[PDB]
Amino acid sequence: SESFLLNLWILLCACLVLIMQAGFTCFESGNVRNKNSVNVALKNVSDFCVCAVCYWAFGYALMYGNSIDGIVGANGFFYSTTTNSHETSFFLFQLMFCCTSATIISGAVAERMRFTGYILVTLLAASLIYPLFGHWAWGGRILGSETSTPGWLEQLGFIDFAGATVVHSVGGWMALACVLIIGPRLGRFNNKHGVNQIFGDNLPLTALGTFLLFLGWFGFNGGSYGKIDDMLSSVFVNTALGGTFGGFVVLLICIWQQSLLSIRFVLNGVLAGLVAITASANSISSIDAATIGGISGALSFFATILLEKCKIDDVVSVVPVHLIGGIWGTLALAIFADGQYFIAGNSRVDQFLIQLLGVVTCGIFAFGLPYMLIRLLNRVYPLRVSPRVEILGLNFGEFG
Amino acid sequence: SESFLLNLWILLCACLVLIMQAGFTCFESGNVRNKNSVNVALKNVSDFCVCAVCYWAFGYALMYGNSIDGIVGANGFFYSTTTNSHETSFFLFQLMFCCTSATIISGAVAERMRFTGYILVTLLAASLIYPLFGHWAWGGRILGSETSTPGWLEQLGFIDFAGATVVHSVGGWMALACVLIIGPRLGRFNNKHGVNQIFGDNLPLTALGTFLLFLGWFGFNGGSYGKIDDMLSSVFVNTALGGTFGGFVVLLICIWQQSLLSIRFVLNGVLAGLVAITASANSISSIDAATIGGISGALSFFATILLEKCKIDDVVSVVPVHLIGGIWGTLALAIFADGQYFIAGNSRVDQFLIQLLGVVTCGIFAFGLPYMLIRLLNRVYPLRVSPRVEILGLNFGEFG
Amino acid sequence: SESFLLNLWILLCACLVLIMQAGFTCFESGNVRNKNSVNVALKNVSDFCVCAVCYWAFGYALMYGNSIDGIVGANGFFYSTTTNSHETSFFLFQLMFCCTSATIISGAVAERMRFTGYILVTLLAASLIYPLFGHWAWGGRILGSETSTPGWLEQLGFIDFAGATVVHSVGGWMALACVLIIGPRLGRFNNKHGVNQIFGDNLPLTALGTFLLFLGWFGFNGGSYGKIDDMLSSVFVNTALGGTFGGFVVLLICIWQQSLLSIRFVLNGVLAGLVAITASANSISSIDAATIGGISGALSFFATILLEKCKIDDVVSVVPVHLIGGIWGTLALAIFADGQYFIAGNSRVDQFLIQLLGVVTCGIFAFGLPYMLIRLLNRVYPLRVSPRVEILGLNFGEFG
Numbered sequence A, B, C: 001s002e003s004f005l006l007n008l009w010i011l012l013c014a015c016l017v018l019i020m021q022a023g024f025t026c027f028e029s030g031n032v033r034n035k036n037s038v039n040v041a042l043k044n045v046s047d048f049c050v051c052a053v054c055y056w057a058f059g060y061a062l063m064y065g066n067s068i069d070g071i072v073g074a075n076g077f078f079y080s081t082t083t084n085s086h087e088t089s090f091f092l093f094q095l096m097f098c099c100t101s102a103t104i105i106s107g108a109v110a111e112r113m114r115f116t117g118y119i120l121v122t123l124l125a126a127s128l129i130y131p132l133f134g135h136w137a138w139g140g141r142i143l144g145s146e147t148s149t150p151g152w153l154e155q156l157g158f159i160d161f162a163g164a165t166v167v168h169s170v171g172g173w174m175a176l177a178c179v180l181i182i183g184p185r186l187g188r189f190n191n192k193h194g195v196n197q198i199f200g201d202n203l204p205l206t207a208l209g210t211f212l213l214f215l216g217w218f219g220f221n222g223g224s225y226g227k228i229d230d231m232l233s234s235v236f237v238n239t240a241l242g243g244t245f246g247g248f249v250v251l252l253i254c255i256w257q258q259s260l261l262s263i264r265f266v267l268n269g270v271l272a273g274l275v276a277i278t279a280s281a282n283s284i285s286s287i288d289a290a291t292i293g294g295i296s297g298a299l300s301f302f303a304t305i306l307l308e309k310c311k312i313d314d315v316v317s318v319v320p321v322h323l324i325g326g327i328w329g330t331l332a333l334a335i336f337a338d339g340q341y342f343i344a345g346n347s348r349v350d351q352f353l354i355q356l357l358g359v360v361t362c363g364i365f366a367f368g369l370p371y372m373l374i375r376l377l378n379r380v381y382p383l384r385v386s387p388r389v390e391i392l393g394l395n396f397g398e399f400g
């Protein structure tokens, strides 16, 4: 039966996506202080299970089900059986994407968000924000379907190969809302323009985590390809170049400017390069992959510094990596991608405009609505830990 | 040639099984104190090599060779060549299973078992217990054989898709024998009903380890499927749901009862869910996978507390995860599995009875015989470290 | 299209090779002191990105391009498009090999080499040494080419299945040059024959790293196979036996001689066994894989002790593992490999002689030339950190 190879491919790609969970756990846990080390681990596994349960129970239905009004899908609840012989593999892969998007959120708020806060934000992400935006961008993109209808953004021509916007930007916007609402760590910023660095206690784990993320990204992009043809290997090369030029560019910056704890920035550079090529890995050349990735690295470095100037404390640099990288990648698609991947009646300017409309829509929905709901939640159920718990650390203070 | 795809699948699944070794190393090492950190690592790599050598030299022969009397197989020693074009891939995968079962044993006895004790218990597991029980349950299940004869349990109808009993229960029973014989850590229990917690010093590594185990489990189940058809992806979905509902259920328990160091229990919940679906991933629905996994999570939580009440010190909760999860999964198969996977002349009651006979046989052989031999060994070659070595830690005390 | 399965195989094997990067990071970082922990991580990610950029930009061209004079290839710069439907997958896999070879170098010089020194040595490796030796040994071995010409060593009959010489020996020779030039750590050796051990502070990570390397090695060997046939699974079995007998033999030595911190040696044994079978995994029996791997383990143990006697400080034992294992594997091919894999007009003696010529050529070029250039560089740009930085540690002293 023909359908075997593609199913096996998707299943293996889904496995690689799951290693990104290990990667996030390591990346975050090494960027935090020992007194907070256990919290990050509990949240990463807990967040995963919650997200999976939600996506299985109804998130897949909302995102990929037949569209009632075009807002939201309305079938595929408690996913089990299908007549589409690619759908089960696809469901598993898409479940891993949902888990990715939500996991992304949690690294920004480290060292001062209460545990039940991670859970409630994860619920919001998995239940509403991710599947709804998902439907609008990718609602019609069901592997092996005969019967599918495009989401409204998708129909206007919005392109996102593997989720620079759908996964990465959605996570990043929600992370930005979270850090603005809970506020900066004690001791991070002082009085006028004072910025103290707070360094993780297990930074080798952050390099392990960077390599695990990089590995998982091959599955992330490779499993989104929708088929097999002789151009699949070009998605892999472009993934490798995106990440490596992201890091290499930051390395050049960093040698030049003699950055202290340069390890944080080069590692984030790699991740930003990977995020940026996620929109377009299938539609660009190797030179353009290097270019897009490299620029994303540079953007991540400058965005990190900008956030500090704004007194926003994003512990692992979710916003510089995922949000700025994801916006950059989504727009860059219009600039660099071979025009044959666009709508026939779209020029590069037309593609730029719809990529931008997607970016803006994502910001309004994934920053705007969470910002309002999380601010509401926080008035009646404070999300920041007590000063005592922050000082002593979530390990002893929160988890005894 | 047709046989290529299945061979490549098995080889990749075997690779995933090997990442479970990394996962066990991290899971255990994070649950132990720094003064013992090196011991756990030395034992994990050492145990692997010993087990592999044994399985290659003769364990495969005993487990899968043509059956002399039905007790034990008697060909395939020093495995090299075959006329079965699937046998070499299969041998490698089965070798990784043997290594899995033995590795499982070692986390229960942490912080007070002498190194050479791990080695001798590993020898017992790999040489006798695992391959013999293996033969009885799976002796006929040689990928691509024309000529095979079923083991006696297998012949009566005993079902175990990927080893809830064969791998997980066997390891767990041997772990239980080991902890009973070496006894509890100093400072764990006091006088009447006193229970002191002893917490690991690198618990982020235990989350890394949980994700690596979860990833490896896809290979563990996927490589046991015996073929490819369009239902393979359902084994993957059921694996994902088993693990995630295991963790999710414990999370619900834990929020409710406000558990201290909840991270230990949610992580074990995930592993218990995975163990439970290992018996039946190919024969149940997605809803039943969630159900079986979820119940396994709950059982693991309550079993953990029960063992403490019995003053049994199982450091990483091998028995709650692997043994209680494995027994539960093996019995649950009769309750939930589609009856088409049973013998034609078996009802659910008949299947329940043979699943139970398998459970009991496993306990008698894998707990009973090791308990007796290890107790004998311990009289003449004490397996517990000296109090000085336990207090100072196996790193300095044992490994200088 | 037929070419799909092999491409997917190569891409997945390349993914496994990338996990070796994670493995090296863990292996080295656990063998170093906490005060140096961050440096090792920064160097591992930085080294990767640099190597990738070089290999993409021109290293692939030098190594695999059409041969101008036979010294060096001269096309394939900024690799992008091809008419060979296997070439892109191959390029990615070969890029990961180049990164492997260079990464290997860096663990020997830990705790006292300046960061910019790692970068400059990496540039030398990736720009000149690896691709040029690569061309001579493997220049004609382009997956799916019709038009290829063999490198001069290759033409004489030099065999190296996956790079015991090309990857491992090249890295090891360059590592040896580096440690001789920067010299031993402060406090390592004293006066006459005094040897103080300096132990890593996170040795559990070195076991994680050993398992990740072992896993990646399946991809390393499997992706070098050049095709699919029914003997591919035998390369996997031989990989498993090589590594496990390497460790098992050292375990036997170590129990016997009661080695302190035995974990370091057994782990290195496993890696040495894997390195040794890298030359011949496709051409030997399972018994010979065990034999070659086992001997490599023993050699690694004795080489470790020898280097200490010579007052050479190789922190993670790169030279005992990669160089001594790689030389041993390359020569062992002549001894054990089925003669059908040789040139028709070559006996075992003829094969021995060309394997030896390859070994010697590699030493002259990959030790001799780097030794001279790095010694020159060091006169004008000292590669060793200041005593203050070594004592305080590269984390604070170098990275603030």
Ligand SMILES: [Cl-]
Pocket (backbone or CB within 6 Å): A032, A036, A039, A040, A109, A110, A111, A112, A113, A394
């Ligand atoms: Cl935190």
Ligand SMILES: [Cl-]
Pocket (backbone or CB within 6 Å): B032, B036, B039, B040, B109, B110, B111, B112, B113, B394
């Ligand atoms: Cl221990």
Ligand SMILES: [Cl-]
Pocket (backbone or CB within 6 Å): C032, C036, C039, C040, C109, C110, C111, C112, C113, C394
């Ligand atoms: Cl260093």
